Design a protein around this nucleic acid. Structure first.
Lengths: 262, 151, 205
RNA sequence: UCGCUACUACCGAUUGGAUGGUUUAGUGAGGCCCUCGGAUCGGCCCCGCCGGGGUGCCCUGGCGGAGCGCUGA
RNA sequence: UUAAAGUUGCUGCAGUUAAAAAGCUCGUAGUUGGAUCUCUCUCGGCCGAAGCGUUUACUUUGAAAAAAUUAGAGUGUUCAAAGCAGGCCGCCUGGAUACCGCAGCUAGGAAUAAUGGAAUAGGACCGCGGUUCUAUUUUGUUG
RNA sequence: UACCUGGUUGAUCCUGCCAGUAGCAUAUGCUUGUCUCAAAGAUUAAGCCAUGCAUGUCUAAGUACGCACGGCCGGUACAGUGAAACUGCGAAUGGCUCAUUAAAUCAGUUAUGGUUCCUUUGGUCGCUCGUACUUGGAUAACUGUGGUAAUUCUAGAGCUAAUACAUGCCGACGGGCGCUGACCCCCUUCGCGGGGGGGAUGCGUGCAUUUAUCAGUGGUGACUCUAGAUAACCUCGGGCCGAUCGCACGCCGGCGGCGACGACCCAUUCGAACGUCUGCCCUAUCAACUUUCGAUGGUAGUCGCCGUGCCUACCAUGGUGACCACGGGUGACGGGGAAUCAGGGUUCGAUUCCGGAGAGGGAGCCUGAGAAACGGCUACCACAUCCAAGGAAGGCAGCAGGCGCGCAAAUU
């Protein structure tokens, strides 16, 4: 290739998008933006494929160009815009607010929130540095550059951002005993309390996380997102509450449902 | 001068040698302050680098190189070309039709610093990965351990 | 054209490779700027990413630092002497990095004489000028002359430096790459480095 | 063994021909870089016809001529 | 072209007479090799943070491993190969899971197999002394 | 479904092969009613191509004096729709093919603390102490005169614009902070003197560039990191510090709210480029190979986006090999994968997904963030097109289609 690529094939698209084989040869290639190509949900696959407000890709454009969808408080008319983890989608015409939160199976969930909860979001801390004339600067997982933060905030922490002003209202440090969600790997979508962190200098750290039912797993430190302080999350949680059911337990829980029906 | 055997004056760039202080400083002693760093992955800097006077820019402790990547180990095979050595790595490769192994080897050229003196070709050396230092050199010696016939 | 690829060479074992692709553009080289001595001539080159380099073809003046005194000034480069890379670069008078050149001394001679209030570089023939004597022997107040007098205790220069100030030219090493940034900046030689460089100049003659 | 039929592989004077690939030496298009060069195109000056303002002088506008003038492309 | 072919043989073939052990011995690389030996010093509020135990090979575990394909769960395409859909009278519900040599990373085990630890004692552990460089606490601060 | 059967003898028991048996891929023969899905010029010729098409693009928001339009109002600079043309962006993606290629490509794993990056997203955008209520010259479209056998060829002349091309301020602007510092004041000594202050007058100053020195906000496993201080520098082929556009109209001549387009830099996204460890078929009737002409390393530099013998000068004599180097062959692009299958195994993978390579063969470039681009240009080699013989124009391994080659593959 002599330059950057502009297409995406449907079998090469991220599996959690849940795209079928026989609709087309191509998939929406996400625009460049705050979230990565393989860790985002474009607006077309959310308005058309998940919410079914539109039947074709031309109808998504007609909804978008009417300026109905706000991503974290700003109107986006791009139909392949890379929305991602912890983002807030607001449709004012129907009065709906959604937050992009992984479910236990590793896929983005349709998680509706209240108008009050849509006024803030939680952001991980990626980089801290000092810029010209000694001004501290943050860089988050949302590609947000926030200057003059508290000196107690360090890398791998979580901050709360008010979407109207874009300023930090509170923060949670990274330490054992704090709630977290896994945002990658094989435990994606799982919620649990940090119990240990083993350090491997010159390589990747490992964090051990225990569920509410007593199941323990481990992840790389880059795949951990601190949610709340202690056992209490700072955001509303999806239906599964982060607990991964086994296939036998899931089978029994599904079979018990149809017996209830009658 | 032993330290000045090349056509260009040899110095540590971080160090300034022309601080005009006082006549007494000239009278007292002429010993340059030396730049040494802590190449650190649990390794320790040899005392022959903090007290030496050699000038070499590809040394890890007193030169401009950074150690990142892979940490490996080998056996010194040849010490013939200037300031670099050839080591051997021996391993077993698994052939799965016969459920068996076979011996294979690799010859790897590494850079040897003057801080590691009194080293013979029988002994185990730990090497760390760095940037390309020449056409076929990417590793640098970080620790020297004597062979079986240790004195 | 001129390429800087690695696949035209031999393998470590000494075996000949066979290239699998042709010459690309991220592998190119350009002709050398053999920066000579003369009135300034600089050509701009567009480089990868859309940026620019400055090919200096002739240079006459440069920024040079007297490190011991911490005095950096603009100075007219005069002549090219011993080169550590090639002794052919001195016959053609080519400026490159880490080259030994001669520079004027008057900007340094003015700062020394205006700061320490002592005559440096004056020959033993009683050369006195009213402007110079107003620089040197102007009458100051009590506190100003006290501050000047407590300063003359450490206003001493080496014997190799003061000889050069007799002939009006100092020896300097260019610490900048003139064919890449378009300018020749550097530092004046001192101490054991000057001692080393004064030997190999004499050893070429 | 000798006599009769067919087909393969090999040796072979002819320093065999056809096809293609390597190189010695010499010549060497075209682009690119450097040093020159200067067909043309302006501007600021100098005079000649001359209006306005400020005060014989300057700022101006239409210009024409010409000067081995300087400066730019 | 695969099986049949235990007629390419690692599992797993043959070499007295059917095809086949070198005329004989030495000898380097390669391959193989006899018994034998039963976790802790400082810190943060009884535990963790930090050192390794000689080093490995081996075994179990963990995370990291594109989708499609393959194995496999659910689902009357009218059955099926398929597909990822669908179901109830606006609601309910899926789009699982397994496998992914070798090499690299991680944490438990210590049988089997290599390897080292004192024999001019330049040995371990304890208290004792001397030579040199040196810590920048203390003289409300500054020399 | 972990399987055998016929054939050497007058008859026997073996060794051993031949033949039979089942799938699977190409071609082919005969036959063919219904219905669902569905490969398809790879093999040989990466051979050659008639013809048509495959890449263009305007919103309220860069530039409208085409009556080209039905129609306002008539002193309204411009009502509106809008061809053409200037400007910007894209054309470096996609599609095709498998010739080259044997630690090369590629796969798993790592690093950039050794580089660049159009665009998206966020930060920054009175931080600099030195005509502005608007600056200058052109040139397209258009009008008119033309040349050539011929092309998406172009010349002269008369107009006219800019977010094209150039120039260039005000303001926040009152200062602050560093050096130089004539003169003035206070404490003490009898005094000289000592100590502590005030200061006119001048020279510099912000961020990016380049060189040198100094001390120790934040962070790494580790910086020669980030931030800081000081003396200077700052390329005319030149560095940032807005002379741009639309919509709503207002508050007390001033102040203004939403956007659009641009801006050095920082970060982010899409990457790309270099390196790290392990891994590939046959061949000894290939056993030594590399080093004159860089082979392994050192020192300094050139060039390069950067790390490096990438290249040069001066030095040293190294580097690989039976654990198979070097050389040769491959009907060799590499993987994900496919067929067969008791268990082990054998064979295939041109082919729609990922990576690589190429556009008849070599080579060289311009533009641009990105190309050594070929539905770009410039040469040479081989083919080949029109011609008034002067000249001009070429590249289907894109979609159809034709020729050729074949056992072998569809609709201009």
């Amino acid at each position: 290739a002599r330059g950057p690529k502009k297409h995406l094939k449907r079998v090469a698209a991220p599996k959690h998008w849940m795209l079928d084989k026989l609709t087309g040869v191509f998939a929406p290639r996400p625009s460049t933006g705050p979230h990565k190509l393989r860790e985002c949900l474009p607006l077309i696959i959310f308005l058309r494929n998940r919410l079914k407000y539109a039947l074709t890709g031309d109808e998504v454009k007609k909804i978008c160009m009417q300026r109905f969808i706000k991503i974290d408080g700003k109107v986006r008319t791009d139909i392949t815009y890379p929305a991602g983890f912890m983002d807030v989608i607001s449709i004012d015409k129907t009065g709906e607010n959604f937050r992009l939160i992984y479910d236990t199976k590793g896929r983005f969930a349709v998680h509706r929130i209240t108008p009050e909860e849509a006024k803030y979001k939680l952001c991980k801390v990626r980089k801290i540095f000092v810029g010209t004339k000694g001004i501290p600067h943050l860089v988050t997982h949302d590609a947000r550059t926030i200057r003059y933060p508290d000196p107690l905030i360090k890398v791998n922490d979580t901050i709360q951002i008010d979407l109207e002003t874009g300023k930090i209202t509170d923060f949670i440090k990274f330490d054992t005993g704090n709630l977290c969600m896994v945002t990658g790997g094989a435990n994606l979508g799982r919620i649990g309390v940090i119990t240990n962190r083993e350090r491997h200098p010159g390589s990747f750290d490992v964090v051990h996380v225990k569920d509410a039912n007593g199941n323990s797993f481990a992840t790389r430190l880059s795949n951990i997102f601190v949610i709340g302080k202690g056992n209490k999350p700072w955001i509303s949680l999806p239906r599964g509450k982060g607990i991964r059911l086994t296939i036998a337990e899931e089978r029994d829980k599904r079979l018990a449902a149809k017996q209830s029906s009658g | 001068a032993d330290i000045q055997t090349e056509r260009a004056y040899q110095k540590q760039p971080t160090i300034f040698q022309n601080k005009k202080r006082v006549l007494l400083g000239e009278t007292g002693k002429e010993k340059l302050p030396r730049y040494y760093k802590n190449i650190g992955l649990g390794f320790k800097t040899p005392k022959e680098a903090i007290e030496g006077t050699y000038i070499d820019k590809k040394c890890p402790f007193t030169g401009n190189v950074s150690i990142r990547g892979r940490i490996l180990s080998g056996v010194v095979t040849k010490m013939k070309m200037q300031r670099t050595i050839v080591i051997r790595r021996d391993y077993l490769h698994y052939i799965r039709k016969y459920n068996r192994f076979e011996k294979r080897h690799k010859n790897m050229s590494v850079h040897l610093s003057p801080c590691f003196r009194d080293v013979q070709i029988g002994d185990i050396v730990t090497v760390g990965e760095c940037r390309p230092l020449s056409k076929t050199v990417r590793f640098n010696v970080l620790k020297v351990t004597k062979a079986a016939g240790t004195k | 054209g001129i390429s800087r690829d690695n696949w035209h060479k031999r393998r470590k074992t000494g075996g000949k490779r066979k290239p699998y692709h042709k010459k690309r553009k991220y592998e190119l080289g350009r002709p050398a700027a053999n920066t000579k001595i003369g009135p300034r001539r600089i050509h701009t080159v567009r480089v990868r990413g859309g940026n620019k380099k400055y090919r200096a073809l002739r240079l006459d003046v440069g920024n040079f630092s007297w490190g011991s005194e911490c005095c950096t000034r603009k100075t007219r480069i005069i002549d090219v002497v011993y080169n550590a890379s090639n002794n052919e670069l001195v016959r053609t008078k080519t400026l490159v990095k880490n080259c030994i050149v001669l520079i004027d001394s008057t900007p340094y001679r003015q700062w020394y004489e205006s700061h320490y209030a002592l005559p440096l570089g004056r020959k033993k023939g009683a050369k006195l000028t009213p402007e110079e004597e107003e620089i040197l022997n102007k009458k100051r107040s009590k506190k100003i002359q006290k501050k000047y007098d407590e300063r003359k205790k450490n206003a001493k220069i080496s014997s190799l430096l003061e000889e050069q100030f007799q002939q009006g030219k100092l020896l300097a090493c260019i610490a900048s790459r003139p064919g890449q940034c378009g300018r020749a900046d550097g530092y004046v030689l001192e101490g054991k480095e000057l001692e080393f460089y004064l030997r190999k100049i004499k050893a070429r003659k």
